[PDB]
Amino acid sequence: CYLSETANLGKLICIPMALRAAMELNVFQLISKFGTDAKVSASEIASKMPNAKNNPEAAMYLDRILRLLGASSILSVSTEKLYGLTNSSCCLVPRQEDGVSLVEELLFTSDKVVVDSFFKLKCVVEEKDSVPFEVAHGAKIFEYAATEPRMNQVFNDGMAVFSIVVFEAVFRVYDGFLDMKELLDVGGGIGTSVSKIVAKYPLIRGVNFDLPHVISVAPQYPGVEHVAGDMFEEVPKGQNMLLKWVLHDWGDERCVKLLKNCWNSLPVGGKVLIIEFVLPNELGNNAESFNALIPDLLLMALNPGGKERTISEYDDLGKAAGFIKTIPIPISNGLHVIEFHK
Amino acid sequence: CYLSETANLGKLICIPMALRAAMELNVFQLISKFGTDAKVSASEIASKMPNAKNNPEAAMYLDRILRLLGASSILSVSTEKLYGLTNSSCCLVPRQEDGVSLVEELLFTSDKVVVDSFFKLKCVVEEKDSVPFEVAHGAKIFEYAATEPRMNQVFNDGMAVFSIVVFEAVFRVYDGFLDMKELLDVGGGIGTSVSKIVAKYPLIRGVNFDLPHVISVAPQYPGVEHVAGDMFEEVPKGQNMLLKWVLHDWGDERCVKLLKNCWNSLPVGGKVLIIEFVLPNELGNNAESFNALIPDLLLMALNPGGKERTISEYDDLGKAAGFIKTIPIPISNGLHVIEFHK
């Protein structure tokens, strides 16, 4: 009956926006600053909030946003209501170690520019060659970013803090980093990714490869030697090559051409490591299943032409260039490390 | 484990914006226009979209979206993917009788002018007397809606549909109407409510009562006398009064005067009927909880004066006006008739 689905389906938008506002207001942190498995009032949390000081009602409005995150299991409740951090609410407290937390990723996935793009998802389907983001902002995404600092930050801050947790995950399972001479990181960005590798495997020689306009600003890393160029023209010579989140940006023709350029500048007895989220064929309310789908949608909103992929499809791509024995390694919740051997 | 909490919290934004594009692309009617327990595929669904006749990749993208819906169980999945309506997917298919769905309501809860307002939920906690809608748009809700047809209509079409399903329930459960001659709808707008009531119970002389400019347009219905005026000044005399989704738009001191004025124009054994979704005293992942939270959020966003309330709070209000019996009557998933007996 309807008055069922008015709640089931009507909560769907309400939760993320309530979460977002909580993140924006620190909440998840200010709560942790009180203790281990602690349990706090709205009136308290708002008391540890500078620009609330001037607002009386600060208390009651916060209690209304929180009880939603409560009922959502995103927070935990006791009785004046008392909220406390949860398993999948701890990823929102920045570590005292660095400052890391899922916050920066999530504030990006749900940014007005991402959602305003989603608000036009119905266009990939109706109009051929429509870019939701373009339809939504009337600029090529890279044009927009060039003139929109806040948008640029949010994207970079996000795919970084993310990349970190993605790498901590690979520096836990994967062993293949022991017994490497050099990795050549393709579309390596400004080298951070590999910087990380060089420092936990000094055994390795670091080559960051990306476009000249990128490389020119890349910081200087011990082990990381930068090299500018067009990976679609020619990847540089090397033994081990990284492709973390590069193939999902690109189609099939183009994905091959890059994977080809890698075979060439790679010796026999040597592999291209490809760090991705592999799309199961059995999609379910699995984090396996959802870690592929989130990007697919983001990829449809921001990059009509990219796509996440099933282990079947990587193996088709990473073979029509001339590889064999594509050895996929499960890492966590879908993070595979599809090895492409020459 | 981060890489787990990146889907649980990550999906929270994608699902809604997917459902939207789905409803918008008209996916739930087309899967139905196939059969009863039909399992259909993007390729076919696409060919039914006359707008997607000329966008080759049409199907490919629809598939990419519908996947995300399958995972979350809006749709149902099988093996190419084949999807079909479900209990929920169903409540988004316009009925043979009336053309009614949750669609119009869910397309409003998630409309851009509402999300935009959600993207300032935090303002309610910080800046005192702040109204996210106003922060986000410049205008007050009504200023904006008078110069913005598309928004105005979306809001009507949603409030419309919601009422229809909300009553169908009331009437399946509440014995009180059979046993009434006069019903005065206080804040009835164009009195579409007190019509539905009189139409099903024609021994009732209905009175619809709202402000001149509202009443100034209401149409004419059999068994309904319209009456212009200001409920917070005087309320017309009447055997019984209805107050559907009124109390919740106002704060305690101002609900009390409205209910006072009501108690002043009632005979003894007269009663105010309060139709609200009621805030449970302990919340959870239950339709009784969200059916109260969703509106309590939309309020903070669009009218922060308004709140949802607990049966005990509604009772305190009534008693303040000098009624003397509160009979809470559960209807469905949190929906109530609360009777204030004079």
UniProtKB/Swiss-Prot annotation, chains A, B:
Keyword S-adenosyl-L-methionine recorded: yes
Residues annotated as binding substrate: E105, H248, D249
Family matches, as InterPro entries: COMT-like, O_MeTrfase_dom, Plant_O-MeTrfase_dimerisation, SAM-dependent_MTases_sf, WH-like_DNA-bd_sf, WH_DNA-bd_sf
Enzyme Commission (EC) number: 2.1.1.117, 2.1.1.-, 2.1.1.89
Gene3D superfamilies: Vaccinia Virus protein VP39, Winged helix-like DNA-binding domain superfamily/Winged helix DNA-binding domain
KW Transferase (keyword) present: yes
Reactions the enzyme catalyzes: (S)-scoulerine + S-adenosyl-L-methionine = (S)-tetrahydrocolumbamine + S-adenosyl-L-homocysteine + H(+); (S)-tetrahydrocolumbamine + S-adenosyl-L-methionine = (S)-tetrahydropalmatine + S-adenosyl-L-homocysteine + H(+); (S)-norreticuline + S-adenosyl-L-methionine = (S)-norcodamine + S-adenosyl-L-homocysteine + H(+); (S)-reticuline + S-adenosyl-L-methionine = (S)-codamine + S-adenosyl-L-homocysteine + H(+)
Annotated catalytic residues: H248 (proton acceptor)
Pathway(s) served: Alkaloid biosynthesis
Keywords associated with the record: Alkaloid metabolism, Methyltransferase, S-adenosyl-L-methionine, Transferase
UniProt binding sites for S-adenosyl-L-methionine: M159, S163, G187, D210, D230, M231, K244
GO molecular function: (S)-scoulerine 9-O-methyltransferase activity; methyltransferase activity; O-methyltransferase activity; protein dimerization activity; tetrahydrocolumbamine 2-O-methyltransferase activity
Function (record text): Methyltransferase involved in the biosynthesis of the benzylisoquinoline alkaloid noscapine. Catalyzes the conversion of (S)-scoulerine to (S)-tetrahydrocolumbamine. Can convert (S)-tetrahydrocolumbamine to tetrahydropalmatine. Can convert (S)-norreticuline to (S)-norcodamine. Can convert (S)-reticuline to (S)-codamine. Substrate preference is (S)-scoulerine > (S)-tetrahydrocolumbamine > (S)-norreticuline > (S)-reticuline.
Subunit-level organization: Homodimer.
Similarity comment text for this entry: Belongs to the class I-like SAM-binding methyltransferase superfamily. Cation-independent O-methyltransferase family. COMT subfamily.
Protein name per its UniProtKB record: Scoulerine-9-O-methyltransferase 1
Organism per entry: Papaver somniferum (Opium poppy)
